[PDB]
Design a protein around this ligand. Sequence first.
Ligand SMILES: NC(=O)c1ccc[n+]([C@@H]2O[C@H](COP(=O)([O-])OP(=O)(O)OC[C@H]3O[C@@H](n4cnc5c(N)ncnc54)[C@H](O)[C@@H]3O)[C@@H](O)[C@H]2O)c1
Ligand SMILES: NC(=O)c1ccc[n+]([C@@H]2O[C@H](COP(=O)([O-])OP(=O)(O)OC[C@H]3O[C@@H](n4cnc5c(N)ncnc54)[C@H](O)[C@@H]3O)[C@@H](O)[C@H]2O)c1
Lengths: 318, 318
Amino acid sequence: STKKVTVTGAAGQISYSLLWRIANGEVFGTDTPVELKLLEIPQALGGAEGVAMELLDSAFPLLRNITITADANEAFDGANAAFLVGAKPERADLLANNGKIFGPQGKAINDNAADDIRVLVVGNPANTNALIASAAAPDVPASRFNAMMRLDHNRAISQLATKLGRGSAEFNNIVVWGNHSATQFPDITYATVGGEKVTDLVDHDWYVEEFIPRVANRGAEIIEVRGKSSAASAASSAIDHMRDWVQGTEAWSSAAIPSTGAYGIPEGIFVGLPTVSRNGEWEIVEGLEISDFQRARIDANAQELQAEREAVRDLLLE
Amino acid sequence: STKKVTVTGAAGQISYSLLWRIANGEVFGTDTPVELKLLEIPQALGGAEGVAMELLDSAFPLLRNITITADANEAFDGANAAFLVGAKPERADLLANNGKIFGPQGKAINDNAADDIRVLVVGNPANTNALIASAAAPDVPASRFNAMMRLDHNRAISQLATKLGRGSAEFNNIVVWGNHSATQFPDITYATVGGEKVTDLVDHDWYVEEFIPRVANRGAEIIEVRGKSSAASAASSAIDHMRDWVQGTEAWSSAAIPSTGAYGIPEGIFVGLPTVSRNGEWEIVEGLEISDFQRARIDANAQELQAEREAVRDLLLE
Ligand SMILES: NC(=O)c1ccc[n+]([C@@H]2O[C@H](COP(=O)([O-])OP(=O)(O)OC[C@H]3O[C@@H](n4cnc5c(N)ncnc54)[C@H](O)[C@@H]3O)[C@@H](O)[C@H]2O)c1
Ligand SMILES: NC(=O)c1ccc[n+]([C@@H]2O[C@H](COP(=O)([O-])OP(=O)(O)OC[C@H]3O[C@@H](n4cnc5c(N)ncnc54)[C@H](O)[C@@H]3O)[C@@H](O)[C@H]2O)c1
């Protein structure tokens, strides 16, 4: 019952934190054996050999095989899950410079991966990289591509937990709507902490003017204090996302999934939405009411995502 | 029922891989809340503040609090478990330079930790650093201090797995006797795989002349292929040791524990031994027969540990 798991950018900072928490059985379960398929660029293939050697040396009982390649067809062959972490850390330059990676990777997924493939895009810009990847994969349902907004979601929960002196575990119904950028909307409209509305426990003006920018700009705060961008927390958030996708969760998880036209967000973009996992599928929470406050922030994110889609329109292979 | 866990060298490479696999419940169990107590030297507090920020951002349900300090009394206050990773990179000079750290840290554990304290010493030279820390803790049983030989043990099982095309988990009764150095003795005398003796499956001369130095010099091999000593695999092995210590194992684990005089090893050193974990204690496997082959290699390790102990004799506080 071996799960084949591809990780791109395997010689990078995020992957170094990621791979030990796939191998330990955290994602697919402690009784599910795994094989790690590492993809890098030719220049970083030596880096990737060193990490395969450290993985072997860890003697993970569930880790049955480790393959290292610069060939996307080899890396995605039989893949049941993929973490597309590989990318290089002006905005138009980044959309196109990383955009051109995800078309070929989406094609390689399309042509080589198992029927049950699930793909999480971590590489920035995440939501538009998932669009490009999905558009090169006409034989794979769009819903098998997600972009990661779980770091934003985890940072929102963590800031709420420090503000109220409560446990992170105690919060329910956090949504981070939209794009993985400074436009993101960490939304506490439905949030509860032990029977009580969170909106009852925090000053609305503090939430709008302090909490939203603190979460939305947290990555810059990490670079300031650390000297380089987050890695362990980004990997942690990717492990949470794939674990919830695969095992299921009734906790709202802020999966960035293909827009269906729900909540007046147009089709053709990948968006943070209020999302639960059942039978290996994300489901949009239906029947929520949208305030004018909410509407302005959700439409700001939808609009930004359509801007990004038009910037990379010629990188859409199909 | 919150476990307080101290990690020293918290701004370093190993701790960066270690802390996410404590916070996730892997060590004490998925129902046991944890508090992380990070200790660093003054010049690295900024770094450890970075790490505490990413830990918070991960929104671990079991992580109830994170403390950062340069004061060893604060770091060890009520500690239930400790990972002593903090250390600096000629042997006589390394023994003294890192030796002078572990005396004070043992005193700090003695004066401040909970009754149930368990201490794993990772910082090199590991076996002698455990001796020094234990000598500075007269009110703590010496058996609450261990040195990490689990990476050596994990490497031995992984090279056996490669050589025989078997899963790492299929191996039983592996022991790495002695010191965490190039003198270590990965011993297959008792080891089994698929109901056969490992010694019936490998050439004795390859084992002695290829396998032993490959395991014993693997560190140098990692520094070679990566340009950076192992971190992720060192952390993974530290997780394995503490998990096994706390949760129990029927598998021999190679804990470096205080010599009782078993197998003709003199008392007063910390030495890798054939060891299983029951009810929170390492138990030496008794009644094994020792061949002349084994005796030479066990005695060479015992004698090296007596050399090291004599080199640091004036650093023993009590
Ligand atoms: N929440 C999120 O979505 C989130 C969080 C943090 C970081 N990120 C992003 O994750 C990505 C990786 O971050 P990092 O710190 O690991 O970067 P890194 O520089 O440490 O690692 C990236 C690795 O990807 C490799 N790579 C480049 N092109 C590749 C290709 N075509 N195929 C495979 N690998 C390729 C590089 O060789 C490098 O080893 C960046 O885009 C970063 O901005 C996203
Ligand atoms: N199997 C093993 O036992 C094993 C395996 C690998 C490495 N190691 C050892 O583990 C240690 C850590 O390796 P690393 O890669 O994390 O090193 P690193 O240099 O990346 O990190 C070491 C950290 O310890 C800190 N430190 C120094 N003196 C300290 C003190 N007195 N109190 C608290 N913190 C202090 C430093 O500031 C630094 O942040 C080294 O001694 C290394 O040789 C042992």
